[PDB]
């Protein structure tokens, strides 16, 4: 299990103050959102809708302050690169904590990108940074004088873990219960001598899945069309894996579905 | 030109408030306060009249980095000349430096005293207050990993602050107060 936060701050030069958007996840389940464009911290999962109104006021306050720090950060970042006023720029930050089978801390992380490019990251020891470039060395130097590394290490080792374990208890019936996929295979003719076999995985949580096509039990890693795992909208995920086979050799192909919410892998076969 | 004064002073601690007082001999019925810096602004205030002094008290709210910079005030009768620039700094954003005196904090009148501001943090610059108008760039890293500057200097309590060249109006937490006794 993990808890991750994603900040996206985007300057709107001459179109107002920078837009700050934040989202919080617990594994693959979003639970909170914030948009500076009456900016309010808002629950997106029912197991945080059960925190009180003082939790949420505190949350909102930190959010609106992160939006004001990001607004200054983007004003500094443009200065570091001698970038003009007119151009829109992006500041992203992802941070959070993983937990091990003991329900305690495995690793903490905190990484930032400027216009999509790595910028500064907190090293694993949670005491130092790596600076991607010479602009990010000014930021490292300020964060070190700020004594930030400790603030973060107290977050990642303490409050990040304590609230993940509280979230996971509050959502045990949703968050601690893998949903295995519902699978079927479809079939389509392809030109005169070929045919598409499509292996479907639907309604599965969490999103980690492996679909594999086997010819006589041989992995068809090449010549397999694998679509990106996609959100369904109801909290579950979808993925399909197609393969183009010769007409009349369809019976040699098996689809294999691996998902942690399954006590045996699923093997599928289109039969006519 | 009008006068612009910070009360209690132009060094504002983060999350604290300062008042800029704009006042003139000419009777202006409005006052303008303009900041130039990272984020610019213009503040409009009606203007109190008492004994031929026209005055307005701009309140600069919980000090944040965007409120720091160079303020000017103007008066209009419906714009006057600018009031001389007033640099308002934010302090307390970074760890505080150490302030020393060679030969020692207590000297006799006539002995030259020097102050050394130093830190393990890589401040580019160091500021000497007592009110502040002394800036000496840092030198370092020293073998210790220290960045340090020296202020060759009757009597008073001294503080020193670090800052970085990119943000000249953003200073460290104040150093502990050092009292120079000139006996």
């Amino acid at each position: 299990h993990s808890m991750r936060y994603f900040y996206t701050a985007v300057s709107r030069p001459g179109r107002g103050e920078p837009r700050f958007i934040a989202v919080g996840y617990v594994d693959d389940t979003q639970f909170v959102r914030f948009d500076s464009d009456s900016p309010r911290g808002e629950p997106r999962a029912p197991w945080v809708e059960q925190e009180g109104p003082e939790y949420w006021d505190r949350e909102t306050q930190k959010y609106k302050r992160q939006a004001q720090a990001d607004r200054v950060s983007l004003r500094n970042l443009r200065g570091y690169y001698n970038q003009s006023e007119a151009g829109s720029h992006t500041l992203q930050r992802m941070y959070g904590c993983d937990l091990g089978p003991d329900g305690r801390l495995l690793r903490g992380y905190d990484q930032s990108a400027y216009d999509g490019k790595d910028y500064i990251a907190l090293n694993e020891d949670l005491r130092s940074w790596t600076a991607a470039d010479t602009a990010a060395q000014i930021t490292q130097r300020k964060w070190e004088a700020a004594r930030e590394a400790e603030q973060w290490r107290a977050y990642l080792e303490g409050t990040c873990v304590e609230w993940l374990r509280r979230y996971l208890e509050n959502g045990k019936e949703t968050l601690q219960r893998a949903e295995h996929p519902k699978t079927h295979v479809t079939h389509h003719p392809v030109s005169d001598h070929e045919a598409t076999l499509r292996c479907w995985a639907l309604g599965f949580y969490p999103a980690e899945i492996t679909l594999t096509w086997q010819r006589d039990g041989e992995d068809q890693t090449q010549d397999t069309e694998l679509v990106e795992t996609r959100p369904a909208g109801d909290g579950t995920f979808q993925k399909w894996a197609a393969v183009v086979v010769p007409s009349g050799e369809e019976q040699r192909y098996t689809c294999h579905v691996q998902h942690e919410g399954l006590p045996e892998p699923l093997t599928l076969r289109w039969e006519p | 030109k009008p006068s612009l004064l910070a009360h209690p002073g132009r060094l504002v601690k983060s999350e604290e408030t300062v008042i800029l007082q704009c006042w003139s001999d000419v009777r202006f019925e409005h006052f303008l306060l303009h900041r130039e810096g990272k984020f610019k602004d213009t503040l409009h205030l009606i203007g109190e009249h008492h004994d031929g002094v026209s005055k307005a008290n701009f309140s600069i709210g919980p000090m944040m980095q965007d409120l720091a910079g160079t303020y000017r005030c103007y008066g209009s009768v419906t714009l006057s000349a600018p009031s001389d620039p007033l640099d308002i700094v934010i302090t307390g954003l970074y760890e505080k430096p150490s302030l020393s005196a060679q030969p020692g904090p207590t000297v006799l009148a006539g002995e030259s005293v020097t102050l050394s501001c130093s830190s393990r943090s890589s401040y580019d610059m160091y500021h000497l207050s007592r009110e502040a108008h002394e800036c000496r760039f840092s030198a370092g890293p020293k073998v210790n990993g220290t960045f340090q500057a020296d202020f060759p200097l009757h009597g008073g309590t001294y503080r020193c602050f670090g800052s970085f060249r990119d943000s000249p109006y953003e200073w460290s937490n104040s150093s502990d107060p050092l009292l120079v006794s000139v006996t």
């Binding site: 936060y5 934040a22 919080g24 939790y55 949350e59 930190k62 959010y63 302050r65 992160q66 720090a69 200054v72 950060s73 500094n76 970042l77 500041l91 941070y95 930032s112 910028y119 500064i120 930021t139 300020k142 964060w143 700020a146 930030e148 603030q151 973060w152 977050y155 409050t159 990040c160 609230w163 | 980095q65 954003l93 970074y94």
Partner: peptide, 10 residues
Amino acid sequence: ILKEPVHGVY
């Protein structure tokens, strides 16, 4: 819970 925005200005 959110990380407290202390002095994290870049």
